[PDB]
Structure 1
């Protein structure tokens, strides 16, 4: 079924073109990080032990020029394997089959083209506006650490062989597109994070340089 795949991918490449200011993806990822942090914070006000796997409550963003990666890590509630499968799996299933079904369903619901274009700019899915592949590493108090991966067509999830390295929380890793290389520039990231971190009740940091030789460390953005 390679033919339909060329149609599916092309349809996406075009919808993305409608978004000249894709920066919205960073706002949505920060918003999800914030919700996950509020959830574990609320739970901690009832059960102090709930923070046992990792005592801090933060969002840490880092750029990886070499691998062409953008990492967004929060120490929030995290997701179990089933959650990765149900909460992200279905949302990231925009392949030939899924895309067409939702399309004809779009005719049924009578949704407008605007309402279609709009779905590409909100929530977790907005990550694809700038990424070819998205990798999610998560650790929830009720499960072992897992890795989920998707290219917006298929998705797979397996137990992280490195074991529990997060303690608790989630890392969203974005494999950026060539045209999104901008989101690898230290100053662009700092500007956008500072822009969307104003109403989050948790410290958000960006890995940056300071200044002996030059040193790199977490710089507070809000």
Structure 2
């Protein structure tokens, strides 16, 4: 269940981290963008597949902060990833050209263009966990501290229905992303042009918690 990252991915992670150290908040923009892409994918599949949305009838992005556990969660009800996809799509990668472009650039816009924004999560996380459920497979968990990664069948079973949850164990210097005021402001900014509703789990005054629409 243990795997090593492809050399190119190791270099890419380092380039991204060294290039965006000044604007770490971009990680949320990238995770939201990826969630949107995943939702576009299942929507495209639903055009031809009548049972496509059976595992979860909604098309949304939901963000939750768990200050107590030092976790930030970004969940989408997109197409999800099979076990094989978790291993291949996150562990391997015009890569040589991009790597040269990044180096020749030192990148915010470039990263999104080449579709490697996911790795910016390491700008603010000591550990990145990806739980995913695809219609053609069972739920699995991918986890990595960037020095290796593992994939295991999720012992909780099918809790997502369909989709993916990106869970970030924040670095000590990234505790700000556990605060609602900050997350709501960033989510609002990065969700403006997303064509799917994005919600943040928040409080409202007793004190009641529920999903708050951000776009």
Category of TM-score, reference length = shorter chain: 0.7 to 0.9
Change (3 A) 1:99 1:181: farther
**Aligned residue-pair number:** 213
TM-aligned CA deviation for residue 18 of structure 1: 5.7
Compute the displacement of 1:137 (Å): 0.2
Structure 1 residue 12 corresponds to structure 2 residue 11: no
Q: State the shift of 1:48 in Å.
A: 2.0
User: What is the alpha-carbon distance in structure 1 between the residues aligned to residue 107 and residue 64 of structure 2?
Assistant: 35
Once the two structures are overlaid, the 10-residue window that deviates more, 2-11 or 143-152, is 2-11
The question of whether the paired residues in 2 share the 8 Å contact of 1:25 and 1:129 is answered with: yes
**1:56-84 deviation per Cα after TM superposition (whole angstroms, max 9, x unaligned):** 00000000101100000000000000000
TM-score, normalised with respect to structure 2: 0.83
Task: Write out aligned runs for 1:72-221 (5 A).
Answer: 72-90=74-92, 122-211=116-205, 213-221=206-214
- Residue segments in structure 1 that go unaligned for 5+ positions in a row: 107-111
Whichever of the two has the greater Rg, that structure is: 1
Aligned-CA RMSD value:
4.9
Q: TM-score, normalised by structure 1?
A: 0.80
Structure 1 contact 8–99 (Cα < 8 Å) conserved: no
CA distance in 2, matches of 1:77, 1:2: 25
The structural deviation recorded for 1:125 is 0.3
* Deviations 1:87-123, CA, capped at 9 Å, x for gaps: 01226xxx999999999999xxxxx699999999951
Deviation for aligned residue 1:20: 1.9
Go from structure 1 to structure 2 and tell me whether the alpha carbon gap of 1:16 and 1:50 turns closer, same or farther (over 3 Å shift). Answer: same
User: How many angstroms does 1:209 deviate by?
Assistant: 0.3
**TM-aligned CA distance change 1:102 to 1:159, over 3 Å:** farther
CA distance, structure 2, for counterparts of residue 202 and residue 7 of structure 1: 30
SS at match of 1:21: coil
Distance 2:59 2:111 in 1: 34
Pick closer, same or farther for the CA change 1:120–1:180 going to 2, 3 Å: farther
Aligned equivalents of 1:73, 1:32: Cα separation in 2? 11
User: In 2, Cα distance between the equivalents of 1:193 and 1:96?
Assistant: 29
8 Å CA contact 2:140–2:152 kept in 1: the answer is yes
User: Where does the alignment leave 5 or more consecutive residues of structure 2 unmatched?
Assistant: none
Indicate conservation of the 8 Å contact 1:40/1:50, yes or no: yes
Q: 1:189 to 1:81 in 2, by over 3 A?
A: same
